[PDB]
Design a protein around this ligand. Sequence first.
Ligand SMILES: [Cl-]
Lengths: 235, 231, 195, 241, 111, 240, 243, 244, 250
Amino acid sequence: DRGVSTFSPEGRLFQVEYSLEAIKLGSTAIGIATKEGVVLGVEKRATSPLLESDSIEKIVEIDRHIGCAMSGLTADARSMIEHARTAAVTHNLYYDEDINVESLTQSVCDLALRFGELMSRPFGVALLIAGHDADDGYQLFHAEPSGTFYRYNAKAIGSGSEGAQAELLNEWHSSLTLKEAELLVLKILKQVMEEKLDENNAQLSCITKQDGFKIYDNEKTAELIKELKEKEAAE
Amino acid sequence: NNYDGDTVTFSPTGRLFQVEYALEAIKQGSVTVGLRSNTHAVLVALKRNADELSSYQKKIIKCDEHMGLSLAGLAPDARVLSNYLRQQCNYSSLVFNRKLAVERAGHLLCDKAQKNTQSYGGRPYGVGLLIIGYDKSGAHLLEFQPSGNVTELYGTAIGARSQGAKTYLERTLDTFIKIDGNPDELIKAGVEAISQSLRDESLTVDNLSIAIVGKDTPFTIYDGEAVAKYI
Amino acid sequence: MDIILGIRVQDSVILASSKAVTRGISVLKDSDDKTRQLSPHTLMSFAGEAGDTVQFAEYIQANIQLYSIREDYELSPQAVSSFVRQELAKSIRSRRPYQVNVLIGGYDKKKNKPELYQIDYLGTKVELPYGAHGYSGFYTFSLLDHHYRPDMTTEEGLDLLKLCVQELEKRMPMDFKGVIVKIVDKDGIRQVDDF
Amino acid sequence: GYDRHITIFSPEGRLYQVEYAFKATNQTNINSLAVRGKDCTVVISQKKVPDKLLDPTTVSYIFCISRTIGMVVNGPIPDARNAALRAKAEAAEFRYKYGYDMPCDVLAKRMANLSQIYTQRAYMRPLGVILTFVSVDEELGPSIYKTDPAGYYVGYKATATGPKQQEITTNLENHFKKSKIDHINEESWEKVVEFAITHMIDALGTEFSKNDLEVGVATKDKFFTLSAENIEERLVAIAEQ
Amino acid sequence: QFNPYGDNGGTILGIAGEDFAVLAGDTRNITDYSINSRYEPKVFDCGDNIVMSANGFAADGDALVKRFKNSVKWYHFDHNDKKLSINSAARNIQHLLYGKRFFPYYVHTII
Amino acid sequence: GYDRALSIFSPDGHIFQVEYALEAVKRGTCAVGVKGKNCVVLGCERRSTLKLQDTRITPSKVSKIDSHVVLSFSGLNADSRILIEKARVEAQSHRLTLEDPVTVEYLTRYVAGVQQRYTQSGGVRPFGVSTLIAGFDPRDDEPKLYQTEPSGIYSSWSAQTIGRNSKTVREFLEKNYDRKEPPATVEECVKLTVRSLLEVVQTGAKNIEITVVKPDSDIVALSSEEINQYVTQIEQEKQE
Amino acid sequence: TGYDLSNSVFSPDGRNFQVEYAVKAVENGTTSIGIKCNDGVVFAVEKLITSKLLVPQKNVKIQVVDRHIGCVYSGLIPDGRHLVNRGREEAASFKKLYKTPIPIPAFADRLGQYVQAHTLYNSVRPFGVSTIFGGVDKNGAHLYMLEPSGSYWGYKGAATGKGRQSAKAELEKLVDHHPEGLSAREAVKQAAKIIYLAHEDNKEKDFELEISWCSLSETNGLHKFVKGDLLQEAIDFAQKEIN
Amino acid sequence: GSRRYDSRTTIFSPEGRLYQVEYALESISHAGTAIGIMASDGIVLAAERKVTSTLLEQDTSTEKLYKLNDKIAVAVAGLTADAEILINTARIHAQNYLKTYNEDIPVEILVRRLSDIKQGYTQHGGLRPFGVSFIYAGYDDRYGYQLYTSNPSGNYTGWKAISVGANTSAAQTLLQMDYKDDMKVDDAIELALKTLSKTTDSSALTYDRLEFATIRKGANDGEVYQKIFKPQEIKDILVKTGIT
Amino acid sequence: MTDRYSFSLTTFSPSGKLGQIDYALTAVKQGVTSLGIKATNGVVIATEKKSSSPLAMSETLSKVSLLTPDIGAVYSGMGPDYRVLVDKSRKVAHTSYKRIYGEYPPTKLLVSEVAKIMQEATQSGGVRPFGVSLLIAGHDEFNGFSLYQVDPSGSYFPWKATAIGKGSVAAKTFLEKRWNDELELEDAIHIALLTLKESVEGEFNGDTIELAIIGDENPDLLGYTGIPTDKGPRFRKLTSQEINDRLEAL
Ligand SMILES: [Cl-]
């Protein structure tokens, strides 16, 4: 065989590149950042109809001001979320304040390359980290198993990412309202999803300065889905 | 071929392929330039984005009030090495009340990178660094390679198409070395140097990254509207 | 803490434990239950150093409950007492020993016999017809030595116990705020509410 | 066939790494010889200094392990010096722990045990050396004990090691058939050294100058090496007879 | 038996106004009945508009200030040059002090 | 200590050791879980190539983790004991610190976490086991049924099956289980569970085990005759 | 085969191919030399000027150990630094316990045993440097050369790197023409000449000369770098001889 | 590094099998047959010694049957050296339980712990598994007489009658034929010997190639006795059933 | 650095063989012949002293070793492996028995400890099995005289008489014809010498043969007097002269 921390001739780490292929097989997750808030949405993708879809937890709270969506080997994300929550709470204990979204993301990304012959392999999951702080306002970050993170105005990850990202390139502008962003996530999810989008197989969430991180009810999302279908038929 | 499975293996011609593959990661990285006069030292870096919706990856990192570097290659490896430099600079201050010499900073990075090239299990660092600083012997510029080799220079560049800026600085050597007591002109020379490595893209306001340190100037980084002056 | 008593009669084991928790010159509580059910037919009362007592009792309780789940079977009172003794025997040569004394009352369902074990903080175990810890025995034993018979009923055991509490309430210096009484027999563990 | 890379058994019950360590023994192309007198033990070895830029005084394969024990090595110098440093440390520790000087045969056994471990444990390679230990033991008298990369060791009446070892071995065998005894019946160590050099000359068929040889001598309470002039004095005595 | 603590004397004083705050301290340093220095400052500017003094055993005082100044430096490195607010500094100093709960810094700290 | 990374990524982005552990689960005897309006039923297959067995002492397929939660599995039997032991220890540890028994979701989350840890720890292979975890939360009458697998993912199910020929019995459950109206009684829930196993098993003799869990720590295992009555009743209705 | 894929494996010859492969890395490096003289030693090295942008005199390659030992090497420069760092630790512990500064032969074996240890296991790589080193102690002057295998000897003169054969030939002439001995100041001049003559095997890029020395009379038994007037004087002597 | 030489003893095949466990079972299938039969009033353990030599000391020998405590014994099939490591561990475990609870260890608890040790060697540590299969025969006051088996996988099961080692397929068919539930010890003794006699790879079954043991309540009143048969006692029981 | 070989080097092959153990047994087969015979009042163990060179002093190399005063050992296979096993065997007799019970271990238990050491080299990380088979003869109060064989796998068997190594197949057949349960110790020594002559090719005398017995107590070899219960070692190595005396009446 070969070392886990081996470089390829092109100057990339084999294991990190292979984990990126696992993330492409994962379910779609989309995030959009506005001046009124950040929206996070995911495809649940139940493997069977007997599976109770509400138990599928792919959007997750880290703190009141920070939320998180995932895509890939979702089991790998548990210890990442655990670390993120501890980092957020620990900082509040040491400094009597909220921790910056960027500093949280950096803390999570420090775990990424702690593998070799430390854990035995990289994480096989990508994260979208969305939050708010007083200094830099509403933010969205894409955290990869390479240990790298980019800030985004909008970002899609998962199986339908490259098609959804191209759609986000055209639709995003710096004056989007929160409601406009909500509909946009639903619209783009419906386009890349295999099965027909409804309140049971898709989930929305947002983070605002005022109310913090909230996962939407199935009743609330259902009305936004109905509002979306009516607006597309109206021209 | 059969001798590139790990860093502990020599090839029949005496080469370390894992170290060479790590060197290759730097070549894929975005271009960054370093140059100095007798009074100041300047870093200029071209930042890279994922797409139009993404931010531009930050290339420059501060290590102390009098020292800092720019990166090209694996960014997390730069974070580890810069953190180590922050600690070593800090140890020097707390224990000896002494600012760490830029030369010692280079020696310490060399030795840390070397240990990762002689033992089983580990891997070489996959990043190159340009360290600038001002200490008791004036301005300094260093080039770090993950083979362990550290080199002191008047000017240099690393990353993709770095040969263009490196040739330019080799011609301009006599001019920019004597830009003493004039920060803006030394930066202008650095911005003109990195321009020789551009293809199809030009320097914009959220694309360019500049840093400076000198006689009466702490290590500071300029981004955004603060670099509009130099376009 | 302070007063814990135990009496083994024909068909049951009766444990009586004081209700007072005192700290300094203040009685902080007068309804404290100084006991833990280890298994359906095994009860342990305890007294000693503050904090240590409940920490030890609950630790033993967790271990016996774990055993019960693993084997789908209830350990005999003799087996539970031996486990507890060993834990205290380990403790006495530790950096900081558990300063806890216990009585273990149980009904062995295989033998159809009640059993009472007295174990001090050193890990000194004895099976007895009647038992006590601390200064309590200095008053009650002479009373039990006289009035106790091996063939007594549960009701006769309760009357014998009333006699002991009355003697303690007369001659003891401290107000221990009465006792909670619990019976262990073939049908399990139950509490006498009016004592 | 990874059974030839580490010290595990091959299908025919062999350890190839041990066998290849034996071949490293002759990499220096040097022959050594050891004999016993009445009062002493002499060891001689060839000294080849090819490069003119070398300091010849630093080129040596004989080592003073303790005051009483000497050691000559057949094999590459890095492994030789590794063995020498360990032997010196072992001999010193023995004296501290047990209150008397470590015997030659006991040190040989200890170093042989260490070698055995490298043939059984995978992470450690065998040393490509053969170690010949010499002394005048206070109980057993003149002693020669030799160690190899297999972990084998035994005492010797006399011995030889190197590429042309067999020629030297039979030459010594034929002498002891004739003399009918276990040693060189000689009073002084000087003449025992002369015997050693004489029989090496006959077996190898080469002449020696003062710089072509290296000599170590063990007597009661000290082992020492000879200088070039001490050897030259010895070469003159042989020539004048 | 070796006594790891000493008393370097001196006194400090902090008052807060509407849009300002003062932290004062005398410059005398003593041991027993002797004067070590007539001018040895023990009120320090720690950056981010925070002034600090740790009065009592001077060795512990200097150690604490040195560690807090260092804490401010790393706060900038780890959190994008964010300004350390006075309330955040206070909480951070609590953890510095309580970290030696069983071998305390023998000082009275005011910021 | 033995350090080797055994679970690693392949070029196509798969972790083969985790996927091969799923093949061990596919080899195991079939297990099924069905939850009704007021109960959960766990059914388990037992292969009949083993006669001369002693069923008194042979390890049962369904294990109590606490008095209110049960765990069944499909895959390597030896591997399952390690998970069951850890689960039982955590159940008692939870009671000790929180002063309340575990929820079914929490217990599942713990077991699934252990399984995940063995997919990115050096020197270990993944568990060749998938589990069905069922029960009722303290002071709650809503039935709970969860599933875990070697990768570490877990989820809630109205009804689910695992093991060999599980795709056949899942097919049966998908058309016979109504979400709008789950089995209203204990009898209805057991019958649907037995029916689903009869699609795969062979004979309804000593091949099927059934365990019923009701609220407030009410768990009981059915005997041969009791199960055989369900088998006899189903076959007579079938001939139509 | 496959015997050369792992360190510490004997080939059927009785060779360690990994060590021989490390020697190839040494042969690839720049030329460095050592000259033993009357009461001390002299070290010199070739520094290839890759670019105009290199600051002259500010990429120092010769290293001091303790205050009386100088070290220079050819091959992988980082590996050499690792060896010197160890040498400094070894010298420090010797002086700590025994008070006196470490003798040169004692120091030589400390490096030797350490380099040899990196040929015993497959979990480490052999050193990719040959190290020329020495100094002055109680018994006078000593010059040594250490190789990847851990093999070292004492030398009258030593050379390693890409121009080793040229340098060796020039060294042998000095030994023959000066049997009584060479002086310290002469050895500095000769060192310059030999580096310039050895530069013919690396003549694409022009180079920078660097010399150091230890002498009982000239440097009081301590290691010092040759700079200024004495350096320029040595350069001029070398320039006159090539023409 | 050392990665090159690692056999990876604790991995799955593409089919989801553990290579080393399967290969250890293949090793055990060449070992001398051992049979256990459980009766209502006792248990029989019978085992065939591996091809004996006439100069082997038969009376002072132990290869197949080992005593764990006064109430529990095991029959071995596989590598003897591996079995003795596990036997000593099991003996210690039984004494730990007795020390802790002042009661003799229940049979299943001892079997589970020994089986858990085997399991560990298949999941972690990178070591080869133990090439051993046990038949456990024992008594406790909960379940009475019990027969168990464990194998290198660390999986264990309970039995009325079972065989391990060589020719288990043929042996199990014969046991399945003649076994019934109301059987007595003396009948079980006869079944065990008859089964070995038909499944043996030898020409004829003799006293010197056998080890035999019973666990009865045939002591005096409500107590269990372990009888490891002497050579002469095996010779007599072989004549009494008419095999020789 | 550090021992990275934390995994087994001996593993099961598809056919169920443990390769390294089999190959270790092959190394034992190549080794020089050694044997052991048990008599009514003693035990004898013998082997050939294969000299590596005539210049070598074969007295300094001992193939037959004392483990305890009443137990001795001989081997066939790799000599160095045997030497370290004797060191470990001597120590374990003290650490795990004599320092606990104040008396030397019985033969069967010391054999059991040596077997354990050899089994661990078959399963532990980064090691090969021992390339030797041992024959251990001994006496103890409650078991009397006994003879055991220990193989590379860690298996051990008790023997009335046996042989191991080069010509073990023929030697075992020879011993079967001659052995009875009424053999006196002197008769067993005689048979041992006869059996060994068949496998030896060159010189056959007291200098090329190594032979020791486990017999009566030897008070003269104890080194002190005054304690009645201490009566001396039962292990005795026969001298070169004592062997030649028995080779005349052969
Ligand atoms: Cl030893």
